[PDB]
């Protein structure tokens, strides 16, 4: 249904008498390009099954994104423990200037104009989570004046 | 470090040092060969490589690599130094510029010939 795309695949390992058995990792983003976006990470003894699992887990953890005409409502400096990322809105015709990771996410988010920067740890996995939790925290004048309403 | 600490002690300006004292901050440095030789490479690899000590117009005396297969440098050959480390040969910070001065370009070489001072054939 949605646009499917993954950031990284990786083969981990685990020692064991006689040898080292492997698993594969898959960081996958899913998005409608209109607001819905989600991210999954799945592991499985083979690549394809791994991408599938990631695709599945991804379709679970979804999130809306308050796009104000291709852009974001307001900047945010969310730090995911070790990693830190900075989203910042921009005028149209700017395009999405970001690293491989937030690029993949923000794009499927249907975002098209936004400048960013990955301060702190550059770890893909954590940079990914950071971006998600980042978006999950965006707000519009609506939700805002809605809270300063308390009606 | 508190602002006041900063107001006083301040921040320490970095300053890096020249990876290559070819002196004069020059792009190149003429010099005369003095010990055309053949040294064994670093730990992981192995293949007697062509090097030569040079007395420079800058006063220093340094080793530099000879690029390409085979060469023509003797004890008194004049040559132009380029500079460019060699991860394989510890201590070599420079490179011979093939095809300039007594340095000859690679004979019968078709690809990347420019990096070796080799005219285009017929």
């Amino acid at each position: 249904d949605f646009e499917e795309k993954m950031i990284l695949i990786r083969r981990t390992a685990r020692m064991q008498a006689g040898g080292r058995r492997f698993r594969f990792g898959a960081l996958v983003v899913v998005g409608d390009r209109q607001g819905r976006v989600g991210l999954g990470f799945g592991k499985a003894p083979e690549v394809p099954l791994a991408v599938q699992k990631a695709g599945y887990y991804a379709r679970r953890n979804m999130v809306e994104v308050p796009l104000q005409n291709g852009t974001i409502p307001h900047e945010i400096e969310v730090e995911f423990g070790a990693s830190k990322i900075v989203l910042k809105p921009a005028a149209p015709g700017t395009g999405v200037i970001a690293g491989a990771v937030p690029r993949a996410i923000l794009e499927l988010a249907g975002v098209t104009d936004i400048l960013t920067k990955e301060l702190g740890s550059r770890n893909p996995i954590n940079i990914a989570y950071a971006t998600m939790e980042a978006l999950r925290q965006l707000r519009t004048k609506a939700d805002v004046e809605r809270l300063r309403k308390g009606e | 470090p508190t602002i006041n600490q900063l107001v006083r002690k301040g921040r320490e300006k970095v300053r890096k040092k020249s990876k290559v004292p070819a002196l004069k901050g020059a792009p190149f440095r003429r010099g005369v060969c003095t010990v055309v030789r053949t040294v064994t490479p670093k730990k992981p690899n192995s293949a007697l490589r062509k090097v030569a000590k040079v007395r420079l117009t800058s006063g220093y005396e340094v080793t530099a690599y000879i690029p390409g297969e085979g060469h023509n440098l003797q004890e008194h050959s004049v040559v132009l130094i380029r500079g460019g480390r060699v991860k394989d040969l510890p201590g070599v910070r420079y490179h011979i510029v093939r095809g300039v001065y007594d340095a000859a370009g690679v004979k019968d070489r078709k690809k990347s010939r420019s990096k070796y001072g080799t005219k285009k054939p017929k």
Binding site: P92, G93, T94, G95, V96, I97, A100, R103, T112 | -
Partner: protein, 208 residues
């Protein structure tokens, strides 16, 4: 000096149909439709996953190949398109279609964007009654892009213009098949143009 050389190989690389040539590109092949795959010994081998860079690159080169214009020029414009307020993406395209040699093609006087340049340099062209040979020329709005006095009677010009009548062209353009004149009504527009290229991709490419 411009491109010169096998152009249909470009048709094949970008994968998209590049309407550079005249008759052929509408025949049973812009080179395409017989060899839809890229040039070279491979091309028809299992295609490899493309990097973000591959994309931003090609989508950029695809636009450049289209206007068959130099890298130095193409770039000096993108930056000029940034200084100007207004969507840099669309604006850059704007400065492109305002390019004289291109006007000549969009006005139908030429079969190709390339034969358009030729006509221009050789001076077969005029703009407000003044010969011009620089394909670079930035055509302002409201300009009599007419055929040269001498040039009027000529196998090609006549032939191209003849074939041109009836065919309504360019929402921002005004063809006068009568005196072989034409006018740059106004700078084009976002949707007035149609091209196999997401301009945002080029913006992202030139961020590095």
């Amino acid at each position: 000096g411009r491109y010169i050389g096998p152009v249909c190989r470009l048709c094949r690389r970008e994968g998209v149909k590049l309407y550079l040539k005249g008759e052929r590109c509408y025949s049973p092949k812009c080179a395409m439709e017989r060899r839809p795959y890229p040039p070279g010994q491979h091309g028809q081998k299992r295609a490899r996953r493309p990097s973000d860079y591959a994309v931003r690159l090609r989508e950029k080169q695809k636009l450049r190949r289209i206007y068959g214009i130099s890298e130095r020029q193409f770039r000096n414009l993108f930056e000029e398109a940034s200084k100007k307020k207004g969507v840099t993406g669309s604006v850059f395209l704007g400065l492109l279609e305002s390019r004289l040699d291109n006007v000549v093609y969009r006005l139908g006087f030429a079969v190709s964007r390339r034969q358009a340049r030729q006509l221009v340099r050789h001076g077969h062209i005029t703009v407000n009654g003044r010969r011009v040979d620089l394909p670079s020329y930035r055509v302002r709005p409201g300009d009599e892009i007419a055929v040269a006095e001498k040039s009027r009677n000529l196998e090609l010009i006549r032939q191209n213009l003849e074939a041109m009548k009836g065919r309504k062209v360019g929402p921002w353009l005004s063809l006068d098949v009568e005196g072989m004149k034409g006018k740059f009504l106004r700078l084009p527009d976002r949707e007035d143009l149609a091209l196999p290229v997401n301009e945002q991709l080029v913006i992202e490419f030139y961020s590095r």
